[PDB]
From a paper:
[name] ([name]) is a metabolic regulator that catalyzes the methylation of nicotinamide (Nam) using the co-factor S-adenosyl-L-methionine to form 1-methyl-nicotinamide (MNA). Besides regulating Nam availability as a substrate for NAD+ biosynthesis, [name] activity also influences the SAM:SAH ratio, or cellular methylation potential, and regulates DNA and histone methylation, thus being an important node in the control of cellular metabolism and epigenetic regulation. The nicotinamide binding pocket of [name] is an attractive target for small molecule inhibitors. Here we describe a novel series of tricyclic compounds that are potent and selective substrate-analog inhibitors of [name].
Thermal shift assay was performed to assess the binding of tricyclic compounds [(6) = [name]-000028, (8) = [name]-000107] to hNNMT prior to co-crystallization studies. Both the compounds were found to be tightly bound to human [name] in presence of SAH (molar ratio of enzyme:SAH:compound ~ 1:5:10) with ~ 10 °C shift in melting temperature (Tm) whereas ~ 3 °C shift in Tm was noticed in the presence of SAM. Based on these results, crystallization was carried out with the hNNMT protein in the presence of [name]-000028 or [name]-000107 and SAH at molar ratio of enzyme:SAH:compound ~ 1:5:10. The asymmetric unit contained four identical copies of human [name] molecules (named A, B, C and D) and overlaid within 0.4 Å RMSD among each chain. For all further descriptions below, protein chain A is considered. Both co-crystal structures overlay within 0.2 Å RMSD. In the active site, demethylated cofactor, SAH is bound in the cradle formed by loops (141Cys-Asp-Val-Thr, 85Asp-Tyr-Ser, 63Gly-Ser-Gly, 163Thr-Leu-Cys, 69Tyr-Glu) originating from the Central domain. [name]-000028 or [name]-000107 is surrounded by Tyr-20, Tyr-24, Tyr-25 (from N-terminal domain), Leu-164, Asp-167, Ala-168 (from central domain), Ala-198, Ser-201, Tyr-203, Tyr-204, Ser-213, Tyr-242, Ala-247, Asn-249(from C-terminal domain) and SAH within 4.0 Å. Tricyclic compound ([name]-000028 (Compound 6) or [name]-000107 (Compound 8)) is planar in nature and bound below hairpin structural motif at the nicotinamide pocket and stacks between Tyr-204 (from Hairpin) and Leu-164 (from central domain). NH-group attached to saturated 6-membered ring interacts with side chain of Tyr-20 (from N-terminal helix), main chain carbonyl of Leu-164 and very proximal (~ 3.2 Å) to S-atom of SAH. Fluorine attached to unsaturated 6-membered ring interacts with side chain of Ser-201.
Author numbering: 5 to 260
Write the structure that this text describes.
């Protein structure tokens, strides 16, 4: 399995954003999946009653797409990744660096799902002010943020991280409990990840992915102290040149 040092030495954040998050008129498997993720995260943070004071995002990578509907429903967003270089990319955007990744196609798509109430500029300034803390993170540790003081959060979010981060089910189920340590009892857990998948590519470079099915996922979340409110499985896959998944699951859970 890809080790944490392989993420520190070889995970290229600029390449990663270019292969997966360049929203494209040409209807790429990647654009479709991104459109799938974007309409689910709107559904969860805007239509459903998923709102709170504090949202922690775990495995943020170099991406801000998972936070664009979230910032409508939370006052404070803390973003985390195990890879510093990833957190360095994220911050470029937060600072509105003119060398930050261009997200606006995505910001336009979301500004649309939310019924054009706001322009691109002012949905971007909602997210920037919402993100209060950018922190090192590790889902294998029982205190994944280490020493860092944080109030109990109302929602933990993890997009396409825990498949990347966990060599096996025991580790996977351990990681779920550990994110619960950051959550108020009856606090929301949101996970969007790949189903039946062993790898994904960032350019020439190969990264493992925990190969796990519908049953295994939903079993681990119960084990970890959660009750599932909704669970969803789309059959849409990544390009065959990039990933070997059979689909993607989304879930909203609660902490017993
Ligand atoms: N043990 C670990 N703890 C925390 N993050 C980890 C980890 N192992 C890998 N990661 C991070 O998990 C991420 C997987 S890529 C996911 C990026 C983004 N959330 C998206 O949905 O596209 C990488 O940024 C990698 O650095
Ligand atoms: C963007 N993707 C693509 C992808 C496809 C896949 F099948 C499995 C995994 C990924 N990962 C994590 C695990 C990502 N971070």
């Amino acid at each position: 399995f890809t080790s944490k040092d392989t993420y520190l030495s070889h995970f290229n954040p600029r390449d990663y954003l270019e292969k997966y998050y360049k929203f494209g008129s040409r209807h790429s498997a990647e654009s479709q999946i991104l459109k799938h993720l974007l309409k689910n995260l709107f559904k969860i943070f805007c239509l459903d009653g998923v709102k709170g004071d504090l949202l922690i995002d775990i495995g943020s990578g170099p991406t801000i797409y998972q936070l664009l509907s979230a910032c409508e429903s939370f006052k404070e967003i803390v973003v985390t990744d195990y890879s510093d270089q990833n957190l360095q990319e994220l911050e470029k955007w937060l600072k509105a660096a003119p060398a930050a990744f261009d997200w606006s196609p995505v910001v336009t798509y979301v500004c649309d799902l939310e019924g054009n109430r706001v322009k691109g500029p002012e949905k971007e300034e909602k997210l920037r002010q919402a993100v209060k803390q950018v922190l090192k993170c590790d889902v294998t540790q029982s205190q994944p943020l280490g020493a860092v003081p944080l109030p109990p959060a109302d929602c933990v979010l993890s997009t396409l991280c825990l498949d990347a981060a966990c060599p096996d089910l025991p580790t996977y189920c351990r990681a779920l409990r550990n994110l619960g340590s950051l959550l108020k009892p009856g606090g929301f857990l949101v996970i969007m990840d790949a189903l039946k998948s062993s790898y994904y590519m960032i350019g020439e470079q190969k990264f493992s992915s925990l190969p796990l099915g519908r049953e295994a996922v939903e079993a681990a979340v119960k084990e970890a102290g959660y009750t599932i409110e909704w669970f969803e499985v789309i059959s849409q896959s990544y390009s065959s040149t990039m990933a070997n998944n059979e689909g993607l699951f989304s879930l909203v859970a609660r902490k017993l």
